[PDB]
């Protein structure tokens, strides 16, 4: 690798045949500075605090995606149509801060070693899917060109809570349920 | 079976010593294999694997392409450092430090930024190295880290256990005391 005090990705351009779909983000020291909503054609911030560190003009990202789609078709033929290897992701679930009964917390589900970047991350409360209070990062890049993604669930800790993070991925024979143990 | 074909382009800026050393590396990647690269220290494109030889030769033969990528060291890396990264590098989030028992003592150091931290355990003002288990640094993804440091404990009466946390945001290290 390259030794350096700080690394920025300006940007991470992802484009995949499946979908097809693209993703445009800038990263700094491994965290997501901003993304571009490719459908609305608008720069956006998962973490709005970081919008005070400059905007971004989105047409450059959309031009990149057009070229990325073009380049991908070329590389698929260069590599005689060799599809992506489905890696086995690695899932871990933890809380943002120490758990205190009745004090709002955040459950964090880290899905690491993701490739290809095609994944379903869902939260289960007492074995049932939960949509309220859920958010997630973009596919965040790694120097081995795999990805990780993190999902969040805000919740009020209780004595008989039952939470799982459920991950579906072609690298898994069956959906992986990772139980949260306080 | 379902399958995917992935193209990635990474415009990566490496900074050392503030702005003293700046290095642009653009990477062209099929699936997980980087096949072509521009490295500003080299100054021309290189084929990382055979499948990138067409593109290196094609790009290196066009003066306008070469000048355009070389310029990005200034117009992207040095530019975004002044616009964004200088300020981001001044951002400080002070860690929350808490001790809770479970014998084992658990020092939770949560919600801090940036990542550089040192968590030490003391018993009666003496540093404890043995029986200490520290997690790796934990990236929360929301621009904070956490780290958990457990200490194996056999308390005598009158014992004071201190968790000692040094972090760039702190004027002086945070000490949290615990006694049975």
């Amino acid at each position: 690798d390259i030794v350096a005090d700080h690394v920025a990705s300006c940007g991470v351009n992802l484009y995949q045949f499946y979908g097809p779909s693209g993703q445009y983000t800038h990263e700094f020291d491994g965290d997501e500075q901003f993304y571009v909503d490719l459908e609305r054609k608008e720069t956006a911030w998962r973490w709005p605090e970081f919008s005070k560190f400059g905007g971004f003009d989105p047409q450059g990202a959309l031009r990149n995606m057009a070229v990325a789609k073009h380049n991908l078709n070329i590389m698929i033929k260069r590599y005689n149509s060799t599809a992506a290897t489905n890696e086995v992701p690695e899932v871990t679930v933890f809380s943002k801060s120490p758990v205190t009964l009745g004090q709002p917390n955040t459950l964090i589900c880290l899905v690491d070693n993701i490739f290809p970047p095609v994944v379903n991350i869902t939260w289960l409360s007492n074995g049932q899917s939960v949509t309220e209070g859920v958010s997630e990062t973009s596919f965040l890049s790694k120097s081995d060109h795999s990805f990780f993604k993190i999902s969040y669930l805000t919740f009020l800790p209780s004595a008989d809570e039952i939470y799982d993070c459920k991950v579906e991925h072609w690298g898994l024979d069956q959906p992986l349920l990772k139980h949260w143990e306080p | 079976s379902p399958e995917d074909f992935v193209f990635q382009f990474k415009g990566m800026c490496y900074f050392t010593n503030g702005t003293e050393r700046v290095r642009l590396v653009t990477r062209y990647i099929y699936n997980r294999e980087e096949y072509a690269r521009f490295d500003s220290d080299v100054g021309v494109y290189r084929a990382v694997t055979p499948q990138g030889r067409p593109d290196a030769e094609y790009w290196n033969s066009q003066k306008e392409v070469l000048e355009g990528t070389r310029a990005e060291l200034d117009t992207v890396c040095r530019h975004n450092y002044e616009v964004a990264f200088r300020g981001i590098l001044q951002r400080r989030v002070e860690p929350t430090v808490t001790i809770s028992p479970s014998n084992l003592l658990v020092c939770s150091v949560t919600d801090f930024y940036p990542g550089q931290i040192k968590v030490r355990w003391f018993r009666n003002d003496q540093e404890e190295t043995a029986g200490v288990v520290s997690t790796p640094l934990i990236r929360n993804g929301d621009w904070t880290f956490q780290i958990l440091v457990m200490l194996e404990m056999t308390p005598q009466r009158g014992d004071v256990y201190t968790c000692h946390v040094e972090h760039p945001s702190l004027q002086s290290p945070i000490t949290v005391e615990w006694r049975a």
Binding site: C10, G11, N13, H26, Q33, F34, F53, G54, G55, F56, D57, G60, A61, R63, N64, V67, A68, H70, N71, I74, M75, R78 | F9, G11, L24, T26, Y28, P54, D55, E57, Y58, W59, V65, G68, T69, E72, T75, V76, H79, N80, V83, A84
Partner: peptide, 13 residues
């Protein structure tokens, strides 16, 4: 006050 970004080139061959 805008961030800039590296451009993706179209390939050869």
């Amino acid at each position: 006050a805008g961030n800039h970004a590296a451009g993706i080139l179209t390939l050869g061959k």
